[PDB]
Every structure is written in C-alpha cells, then in structure tokens.
Amino acid sequence: PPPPPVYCVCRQPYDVNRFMIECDICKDWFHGSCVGVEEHHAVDIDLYHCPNCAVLHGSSLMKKRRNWHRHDYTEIDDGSKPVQAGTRTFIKELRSRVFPSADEIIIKMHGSQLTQRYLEKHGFDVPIMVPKLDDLGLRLPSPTFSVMDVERYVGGDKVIDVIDVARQADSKMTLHNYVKYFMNPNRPKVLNVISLEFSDTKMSELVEVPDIAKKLSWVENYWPDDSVFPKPFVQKYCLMGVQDSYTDFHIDFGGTSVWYHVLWGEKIFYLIKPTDENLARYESWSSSVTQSEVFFGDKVDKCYKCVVKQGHTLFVPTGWIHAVLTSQDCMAFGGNFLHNLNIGMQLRCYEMEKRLKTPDLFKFPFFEAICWFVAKNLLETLKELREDGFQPQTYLVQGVKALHTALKLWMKKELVSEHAFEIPDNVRPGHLIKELSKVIRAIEEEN
Numbered sequence: 001p002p003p004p005p006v007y008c009v010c011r012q013p014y015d016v017n018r019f020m021i022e023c024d025i026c027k028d029w030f031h032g033s034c035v036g037v038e039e040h041h042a043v044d045i046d047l048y049h050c051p052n053c054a055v056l057h058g059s060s061l062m063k064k065r066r067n068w069h070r071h072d073y074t075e076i077d078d079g080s081k082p083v084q085a086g087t088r089t090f091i092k093e094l095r096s097r098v099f100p101s102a103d104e105i106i107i108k109m110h111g112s113q114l115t116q117r118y119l120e121k122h123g124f125d126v127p128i129m130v131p132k133l134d135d136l137g138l139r140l141p142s143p144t145f146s147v148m149d150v151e152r153y154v155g156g157d158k159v160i161d162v163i164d165v166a167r168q169a170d171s172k173m174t175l176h177n178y179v180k181y182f183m184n185p186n187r188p189k190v191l192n193v194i195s196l197e198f199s200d201t202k203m204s205e206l207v208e209v210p211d212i213a214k215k216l217s218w219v220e221n222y223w224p225d226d227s228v229f230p231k232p233f234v235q236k237y238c239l240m241g242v243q244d245s246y247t248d249f250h251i252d253f254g255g256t257s258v259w260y261h262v263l264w265g266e267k268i269f270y271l272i273k274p275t276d277e278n279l280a281r282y283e284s285w286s287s288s289v290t291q292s293e294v295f296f297g298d299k300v301d302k303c304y305k306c307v308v309k310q311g312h313t314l315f316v317p318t319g320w321i322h323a324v325l326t327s328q329d330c331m332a333f334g335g336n337f338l339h340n341l342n343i344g345m346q347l348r349c350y351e352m353e354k355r356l357k358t359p360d361l362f363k364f365p366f367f368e369a370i371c372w373f374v375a376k377n378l379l380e381t382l383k384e385l386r387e388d389g390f391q392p393q394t395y396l397v398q399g400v401k402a403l404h405t406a407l408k409l410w411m412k413k414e415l416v417s418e419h420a421f422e423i424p425d426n427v428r429p430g431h432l433i434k435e436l437s438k439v440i441r442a443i444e445e446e447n
C-alpha cells in the first residue's frame with residue numbers, strides 16, 4: 001500500500017495551478033510561496049536548493065551576469081548581438097538620446113476648456129496635457145497616497161501581473177510581495193506593474209475618471225446593463241513602477257484613447273503620430289524577428305519626448321504609438337475609453353491586432369460586441385437628427401460609415417462564423433446593416 005504522492009514542505013498533493021520549482025539536491029518540488037521564491041526569480045536560478053538542503057549545501061547556484069545589454073544577461077559580452085529593450089544599457093542610451101520636445105505638438109489646456117463640444121470642433125488627434133487638476137472631474141486619493149495604502153485598500157493577497165523589464169517578460173506576484181519589493185530602496189532588479197485594474201476593489205471608490213472620459217466613453221453610453229456579456233472594465237488602472245521601468249512602443253488595445261495621471265514620480269512618454277506610413281512601419285516592426293533589438297523611435301520621422309511630472313494629467317488619442325520610461329519611482333492612475341471622434345482609426349487598430357495575432361488577453365474585451373451596440377444607437381441618433389431638420393456632423397457621418405463597412409465585412413459568408421458569438425442577443429445584424437446603408441444614402445443625397 002504505497003504512500004499517496006505529496007510534495008513540498010507542506011506535504012500536499014500536486015496542484016497543476018500553483019508555481020513550483022525543483023530542488024537540484026533532493027529532486028523534490030516546492031511551491032514558490034512556501035519557500036519564498038517568486039515566479040520572476042526562477043529564470044535567475046540555475047540550480048535550486050530548498051531551505052532544508054541549503055543548510056548543508058549552501059544557497060541556490062545562481063546564473064552569472066556577463067553583460068548589461070541583453071535579455072539573457074549570461075551571454076558573453078563581446079561585440080556580436082545588439083542592445084535589447086529594457087536592459088540597463090538600453091536605458092542609458094535612451095536617457096542620452098535627443099528627441100524633439102512634445103511641446104511641438106501637444107495642447108496644454110485648463111480642465112474647464114476640455115469639453116465634448118471642444119473636441120467635436122477641434123478634433124481629438126494630438127495629446128492633450130492638463131497641468132492642474134481643476135475642473136477635470138477627476139477624483140483621486142491625496143498626493144500622500146502610497147503603495148502601502150494601495151495594499152491597504154486592495155488587499156495584500158491579490159494576484160497581479162508584474163513585468164521583469166530587463167527581460168521584457170511577465171509573471172505573477174501578490175500585491176503584498178510587490179509592495180514589499182517596492183519599499184526596499186535596494187532593488188535586485190527592475191519590476192513594473194502596469195495592468196492592475198481596480199474597479200472591482202474597495203479602492204475603486206477613491207477614484208472617479210475625468211468627466212471628458214465618462215462623457216465620450218462607448219461603454220459608458222452604449223453598453224446595456226442588461227446584456228449577457230460581462231461588461232468590460234478597463235476604466236481604472238493603478239500603475240506602479242520603480243525607476244528605469246520601461247514599456248516599449250505600442251498602441252492601446254482596441255485603438256482606445258487613454259488618460260494618465262501621475263500621483264508621484266515622473267514618467268516620460270515617447271509619442272509617434274499614427275500616420276499611414278508610421279502605422280505600416282509599426283506593424284512591420286511589431287511582427288519582426290529583431291523587434292527587441294530595434295528602437296522603433298528610429299524608424300519614423302518624429303518621436304516626441306513628453307515629460308509627465310507628478311500632478312499632471314495626459315490624454316492620448318486613438319492609435320498614437322508610444323513607449324514609456326519611468327524616470328523616478330512612480331505611482332500613476334489611468335484608464336482607457338472608446339468614442340465617436342475617430343471610429344475609423346479605432347477599427348483600423350482592431351484589425352491590425354487581428355493580423356498581428358495579438359493574444360485575447362491583450363485586447364479590448366468585447367470590441368465587436370460594443371461595436372454592434374454603438375451602431376444600433378447611432379442609427380437612432382441619426383434618424384432623430386434628420387427627423388428634426390439637422391445635419392449630422394461630418395466626423396459622425398464618416399464614422400458611422402466606417403462602422404458600416406466594418407459590420408458588413410464581419411458578416412461575409414466565410415467570416416460570419418467567427419464574429420458570431422460576439423453579436424449581442426438583441427440586434428438584427430442584416431436588418432441593422434441595411435437600415436444603416438439606407439440612412440447613410442439619404443444623408444449622402446439630401447446634402
């Protein structure tokens with residue numbers, strides 16, 4: 001009668017859902033949580049020694065650093081192989097690079113001027129900087145709010161996604177362990193936390209997104225509360241990163257627009273305009289084999305450097321390509337949102353993600369689902385407008401049009417089989433597309 005199979009110091013049966021590491025001495029497996037080993041520490045450990053074996057054999061044999069410019073710091077430091085994104089060398093070169101200032105393109109405003117009316121008239125296609133919090137409708141915890149407070153409200157046991165910046169790889173850690181790492185001024189490595197959405201926590205109550213984001217948001221205006229699909233929550237993110245954290249050039253999921261507020265620290269955004277040329281080069285680079293070794297800021301004509309100091313708020317429009325460097329230990333708040341000002345661009349970005357085979361976890365939850373809802377709503381808003389002697393605004397027309405082309409396409413015989421589980425259970429696809437084309441045709445005639 002053999003003894004039931006158990007592992008680790010806790011002598012528990014295997015649990016394929018928990019992170020484990022193997023002792024090179026006893027050949028047993030251990031829960032990282034039981035022996036104090038984080039998922040990100042695994043790659044640094046060559047041959048692991050559990051606490052028990054270490055007493056007579058010493059601590060784990062760690063891998064040896066031979067360079068400062070590659071994701072694999074063990075590689076010999078000769079001359080072959082270029083500098084990779086996120087490494088110490090990369091950061092040193094980035095800090096000394098010369099960029100045109102973002103002052104050349106962004107718009108500095110007062111919160112009271114940033115309205116829907118203002119964006120419909122001047123458009124929302126260049127980053128907007130709002131230095132003072134006044135009139136934005138943005139509520140945040142006081143400037144004294146610290147990472148320890150985040151733990152206090154969110155709870156130390158929550159599992160968050162962390163990024164090992166020098167490897168440009170991610171893993172999971174408890175908030176408790178992350179705050180513990182952040183509080184020690186002596187960091188063994190650079191770790192960044194960029195996707196801690198807290199709408200579902202006690203912390204959600206301390207934040208109220210900017211009025212302008214709430215006013216324009218698709219989810220805020222067109223997503224039915226009674227829908228069967230789980231409402232997408234990408235409205236409240238808490239960002240924590242130590243000095244030298246770095247996120248490479250990308251375009252927000254679903255072509256969303258974003259707002260960022262630095263509570264303390266300093267962040268530097270490298271902005272690239274979404275011209276057709278830039279978007280093309282971006283998709284090439286994004287899918288290239290040498291991506292990690294090419295600074296995208298060198299593949300375009302202008303890469304603007306935007307310093308966002310604590311207390312400031314930045315809004316970045318649809319499709320803009322940007323990278324971010326954490327200049328100082330930083331805590332920030334931000335959120336994403338879709339709107340009617342640049343539907344075409346939003347759809348363009350969605351399609352690019354499909355081609356690039358972007359993982360489901362890195363996209364706007366129910367993008368097509370919300371696109372149907374919006375179309376259904378805009379059809380009515382368009383009728384009512386004409387049924388009152390009014391000429392719909394050009395951008396809205398061009399937008400609803402772009403949405404028409406997209407919708408029609410998602411139904412094509414060969415395609416329809418995919419964008420199926422996405423179509424909300426209360427809209428008539430064909431009917432909708434038809435009623436749309438009709439109204440578009442009218443405005444395109446009686447105007």
Ligand SMILES: O=C(O)CNC(=O)C(=O)O
Nearest residue numbers: 193194239247267324326
């Ligand atoms: O974490 C940062 O400094 C910047 N993050 C992002 O732009 C993002 O998560 O999409």
Ligand SMILES: [Fe+2]
Nearest residue numbers: 024025047061
């Ligand atoms: Fe060993």
Ligand SMILES: [Fe+2]
Nearest residue numbers: 251252258322
């Ligand atoms: Fe971003």
Ligand SMILES: [Zn+2]
Nearest residue numbers: 023026050053
């Ligand atoms: Zn052992």
Ligand SMILES: [Zn+2]
Nearest residue numbers: 008010031034
């Ligand atoms: Zn255990």
